[PDB]
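Model the whole thing, not chain by chain.
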Amino acid sequence: PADSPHIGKVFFSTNQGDFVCSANIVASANQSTVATAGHCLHDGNGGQFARNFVFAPAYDYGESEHGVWAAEELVTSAEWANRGDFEHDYAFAVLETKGGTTVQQQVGTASPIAFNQPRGQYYSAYGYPAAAPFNGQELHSCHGTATNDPMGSSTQGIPCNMTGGSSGGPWFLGNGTGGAQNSTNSYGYTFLPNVMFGPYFGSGAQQNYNYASTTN
Amino acid sequence: PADSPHIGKVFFSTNQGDFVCSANIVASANQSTVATAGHCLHDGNGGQFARNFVFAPAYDYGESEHGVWAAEELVTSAEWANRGDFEHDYAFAVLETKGGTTVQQQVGTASPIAFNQPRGQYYSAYGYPAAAPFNGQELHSCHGTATNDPMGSSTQGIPCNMTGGSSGGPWFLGNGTGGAQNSTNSYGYTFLPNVMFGPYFGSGAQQNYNYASTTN
């Protein structure tokens, strides 16, 4: 985590309990924006937003020297919020500033983010899987070539063993944590998933990003 | 109302019961977008989306020939949804398509929409006020020059006697229903009778519009 401190762990609550996800600081005008999954910050089907959304950059068996960051605005895709549309299971959280210090300023790095890229690219996906065989404490990764959702939606799948808690973690184009972010961990099929699915980052994601990243 | 069928009445429900608002068809790529107030489609801080949001173009003691249109995507500003911030009490609803027909195609017209315009312009504001001495059945209007929020926020006020139900109704630059939409009826203050406040249509509103109008 110390080497890619833009990636971090998410804690949040709903009426059903206390849960975890992952997220990533993306380059933004407000320097306060993390990319995550829609389902990590909103119920879907017209419901309420998650409560007490906290981001922990470079989490590693606990918060890092970078600390933990509360959300000020949760920015869900409209298709996710209204219909639980997994084709648009992406979102951005706009975090607090601490006495002038934005999360980007504290952590000192943020991922570029790209949209409307070809399908079928090679990805490195990251997150904090929390269900067995994982413990929720470690940054893990998956790597491989994306293929189409066999069930027929616009999502893409990569070979991956990560479990619940990894949702919202970044997909970077290419090998490693240094590429442009171009999707987010959305879902796998239990038990012992072997494919991670992530939504296509098209013009919906781009325009949601433009909006979130400017405050908003 | 027949002369300005892009303006219409809104019905919706929450856990607190059935409510009414106003809205306006604005030109959009998806041909399906109405401008309204954030509070006409989302509770604000800690709440959820309105249910059964329906738009009735050219309502006049009942639906017009254009019928009634259900929302598919409610698109609230982030600051309204997360904090009930009246500086951003604007929103867009993306409506259903009926047998291939979009609302903009049905009505055959839409208002232009403008952002980042000067403060203190002259407006014509419209809506379906539903509290006495109004009955919710009629299109009413207010006209005047905008002044600054006495509370010091970025909202603006105009002289206007319209009551609950008028929220979400359009403010058009200039005289009449034909100008560019540049705010929405949002709120009054208990101490200030007959003044309607509407949010500033700035870059937040523009980016929310860009996003909503492409479906989204």
